[PDB]
Swiss-Prot record:
Keyword Nucleus belongs to the record: yes
Species assigned in the record: Homo sapiens
Expression sites by tissue: Expressed in gastric carcinoma tissue and the expression gradually increases with the progression of the carcinoma (at protein level).
Note: Can use both ATP and GTP as phosphoryl donors. Phosphorylation by casein kinase 2 has been estimated to represent up to one quarter of the eukaryotic phosphoproteome. Casein kinase 2 has been found to be increased at protein level and up-regulated at the level of enzyme activity in the majority of cancers. However, elevated levels of casein kinase 2 are present in certain normal organs such as brain and testes.
GO cellular component terms, semicolon-separated: cytosol; nucleoplasm; nucleus; plasma membrane; PML body; protein kinase CK2 complex; Sin3-type complex
Name this protein carries in UniProt: Casein kinase II subunit alpha
Residues of the full protein shown: 4 to 327 of 391
Length: 324
């Protein structure tokens, strides 16, 4: 395959000391979980259990994410990344790293965020509300990309919103990675619906632009009230669903530009597809959330070619955000 590199923040990690990006060498200081009393189970994920808790030293609510220790290298990466971005705009704040004395199970303590429901938000969401929260996500992404980090798991479940206080937090940095120009990354990242074309065609030299594809997917489902926007039933099918909107012509131009070898499982499913106009997704139920600005912005995010996508910085300067 043809080599590729990020158009922005290309060398931010190269010009920094080894300690900042070498998570494998980072020394984690595990505090005593006795400072926290668990109140209630909030949810359960693939490799984590999340609890509402009280810090007994200051009577303050916190969120405790007890990790299923399946890979130490991955726990180290998430901790180093959270420490690096600690305090960043709309980045969830890691408050502590603790281990229960008896279990010794790794646990991450975060600031408390009281998330307003996604299905509830969906109906009370205004055109302004979308632009505002999209801009809030861009602040988090422009910041973490400037810090030489790609989230690699941008999706609605990883975006916590406290609608009453108009507060937004980008969470779950468990799939996040440091960007190094020329590095080949694992493509088994992100949630199926939000996976960029680069991941689905096994193009390993990807960058921050991956997060911009995922953000485009979220915007499309929000303005068109179609959740998810690209509804794949598997990873191969996921690429077919994108070709159904973007067309097969631009996909083969993308594979030819980067000399990508297509997996033989794409042989009998890809077919032939025309490019669809963004206007055809507009209906009576969603027209109050759509505008020419929203459609122009979306078109500039959802592109096969990762290099042709808007960066977080360019996206913040789009006319769609003049009102925020």
């Amino acid at each position: 395959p043809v080599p590729s590199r990020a158009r922005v923040y290309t060398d931010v990690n190269t010009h920094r000391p080894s300690e900042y990006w070498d998570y494998e060498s980072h020394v984690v200081e595990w505090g005593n979980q006795d400072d926290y009393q668990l109140v209630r189970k909030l949810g359960r994920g693939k490799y984590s259990e999340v609890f509402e808790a009280i810090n007994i030293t200051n009577n303050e609510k916190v969120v405790v994410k007890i990790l299923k220790p399946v890979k130490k290298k991955k726990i180290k990466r998430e901790i180093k990344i959270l420490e690096n971005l600690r305090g960043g705009p709309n980045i969830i704040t890691l408050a502590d790293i603790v281990k229960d004395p008896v279990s010794r199970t790794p646990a991450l303590v975060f600031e408390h965020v009281n998330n307003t429901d996604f299905k509830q938000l969906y109906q009370t969401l205004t055109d302004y509300d979308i632009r505002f929260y999209m801009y809030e996500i861009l602040k988090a992404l422009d910041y973490c990309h400037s810090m030489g980090i790609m989230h690699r798991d941008v999706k609605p479940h990883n975006v916590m919103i406290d609608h009453e206080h108009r507060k937004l937090r980008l969470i779950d940095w468990g799939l996040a990675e440091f960007y190094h120009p020329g590095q080949e990354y694992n493509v088994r990242v992100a949630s199926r619906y939000f996976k960029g074309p680069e991941l689905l065609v096994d193009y390993q030299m990807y960058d921050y632009s991956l997060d911009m594809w995922s953000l485009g997917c979220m915007l499309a489902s929000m303005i068109f009230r179609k959740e998810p926007f690209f509804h794949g039933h598997d990873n191969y099918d996921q690429l077919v669903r994108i070709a159904k909107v973007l067309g097969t012509e631009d996909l083969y131009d993308y594979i030819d530009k980067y000399n990508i070898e297509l997996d033989p499982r794409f042989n009998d499913i890809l077919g032939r597809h025309s490019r669809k106009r963004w206007e055809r997704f507009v209906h009576s139920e969603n027209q109050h959330l759509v505008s020419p600005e929203a459609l122009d912005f979306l078109d500039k995010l959802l592109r096969y070619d990762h290099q042709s996508r808007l960066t977080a910085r360019e996206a913040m300067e789009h006319p769609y955000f003049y009102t925020v």
